[PDB]
Amino acid sequence: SHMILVTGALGQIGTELVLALQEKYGNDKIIASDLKEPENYHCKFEKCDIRDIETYERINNENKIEIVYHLAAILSAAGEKNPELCHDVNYNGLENVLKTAKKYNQKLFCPSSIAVFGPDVPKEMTPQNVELNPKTVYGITKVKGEELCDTYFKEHGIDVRGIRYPGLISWKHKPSGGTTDYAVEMYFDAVESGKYECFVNRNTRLPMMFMDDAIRATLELMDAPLDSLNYHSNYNLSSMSFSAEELEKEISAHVDFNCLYKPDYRQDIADTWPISINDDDARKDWGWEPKFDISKMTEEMITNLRRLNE
Ligand SMILES: NC(=O)c1ccc[n+]([C@@H]2O[C@H](COP(=O)([O-])OP(=O)(O)OC[C@H]3O[C@@H](n4cnc5c(N)ncnc54)[C@H](O)[C@@H]3O)[C@@H](O)[C@H]2O)c1
Numbered sequence: 001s002h003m004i005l006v007t008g009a010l011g012q013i014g015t016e017l018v019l020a021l022q023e024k025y026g027n028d029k030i031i032a033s034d035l036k037e038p039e040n041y042h043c044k045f046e047k048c049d050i051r052d053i054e055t056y057e058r059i060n061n062e063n064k065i066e067i068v069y070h071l072a073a074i075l076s077a078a079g080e081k082n083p084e085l086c087h088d089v090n091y092n093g094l095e096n097v098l099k100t101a102k103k104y105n106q107k108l109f110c111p112s113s114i115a116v117f118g119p120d121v122p123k124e125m126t127p128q129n130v131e132l133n134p135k136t137v138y139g140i141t142k143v144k145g146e147e148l149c150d151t152y153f154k155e156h157g158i159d160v161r162g163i164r165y166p167g168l169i170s171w172k173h174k175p176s177g178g179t180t181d182y183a184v185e186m187y188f189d190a191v192e193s194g195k196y197e198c199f200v201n202r203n204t205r206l207p208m209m210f211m212d213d214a215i216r217a218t219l220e221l222m223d224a225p226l227d228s229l230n231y232h233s234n235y236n237l238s239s240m241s242f243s244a245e246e247l248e249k250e251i252s253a254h255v256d257f258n259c260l261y262k263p264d265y266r267q268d269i270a271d272t273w274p275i276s277i278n279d280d281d282a283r284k285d286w287g288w289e290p291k292f293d294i295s296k297m298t299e300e301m302i303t304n305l306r307r308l309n310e
């Protein structure tokens with residue numbers, strides 16, 4: 001019963017989230033936005049740079065937007081290579097979203113990342129409330145973003161919600177600017193060729209989640225009654241934790257492939273992140289439970305990628 005805008009709509013999450021929202025609420029309620037207008041695209045679409053407050057505001061007020069799912073960002077690897085761009089898009093873009101929400105009395109979904117954490121806090125089952133001392137440019141943007149969001153909630157009364165997503169795995173839109181991207185790439189290349197060159201070492205172990213779980217978590221959190229929530233911008237959220245070679249082994253149980261490990265600069269990013277996450281507060285406050293383990297995710301990835309390679 002509300003007009004919804006999705007920023008970053010053409011990216012890894014947005015490709016799936018826009019369709020989920022159209023189905024849940026109707027096509028007449030969803031507006032998609034990103035930098036460049038796509039050909040052959042069903043959802044209504046408005047182009048915008050998230051840093052352009054004038055155009056962003058216009059899209060919001062001309063479409064009577066009441067809820068924003070804010071996915072626009074620069075991710076961890078692209079951001080480490082261009083730190084000024086990363087700050088500008090992630091922090092100034094978020095501030096534009098928040099200022100607009102305050103003007104127009106909007107509800108928001110503004111995600112964070114497991115990149116908020118650094119190596120000074122536990123790597124296993126990282127708690128919700130530990131200090132956030134990230135060692136990446138992108139992680140610092142996400143910490144600043146959490147704090148800005150929580151100011152807008154407390155000071156300004158804006159109902160902004162967010163999740164520290166783990167690495168997300170999907171087949172519909174292959175990622176290209178992150179660090180957890182190896183997991184997707186490994187699926188794609190295993191099925192397309194039976195070989196992969198992995199950009200992290202074989203023991204790299206990170207929190208991961210299948211996209212259907214991440215999308216469902218997003219929608220469930222957004223549907224929760226506000227008074228049930230003890231956290232706002234920054235829920236920890238968990239599903240899986242595995243190493244690169246463990247994923248290789250799972251994939252190899254379906255298709256012949258062999259993986260070679262050739263780390264690059266993204267190792268130095270991954271090394272600074274936890275292995276797994278304590279998401280009790282999500283599970284307690286709003287009933288989170290993941291549904292896809294590594295086996296089930298692998299079946300879905302491989303079946304769809306095989307189809308796409310026919
Ligand atoms: N594994 C993951 O995918 C993951 C994990 C944790 C957090 N997140 C968070 O989820 C959100 C979406 O991530 P994603 O993986 O879909 O990213 P993505 O890079 O696939 O999509 C982001 C989109 O933002 C757009 N964008 C970039 N700069 C822009 C600008 N100046 N103005 C407007 N649009 C701009 C891009 O064109 C892209 O389509 C981000 O906040 C990200 O930090 C993602």
Ligand SMILES: CC(=O)[C@H](N)C(=O)O
Nearest residue numbers: 076166167178179180
């Ligand atoms: C840290 C993440 O979750 C993200 N996919 C990235 O690799 O930037």
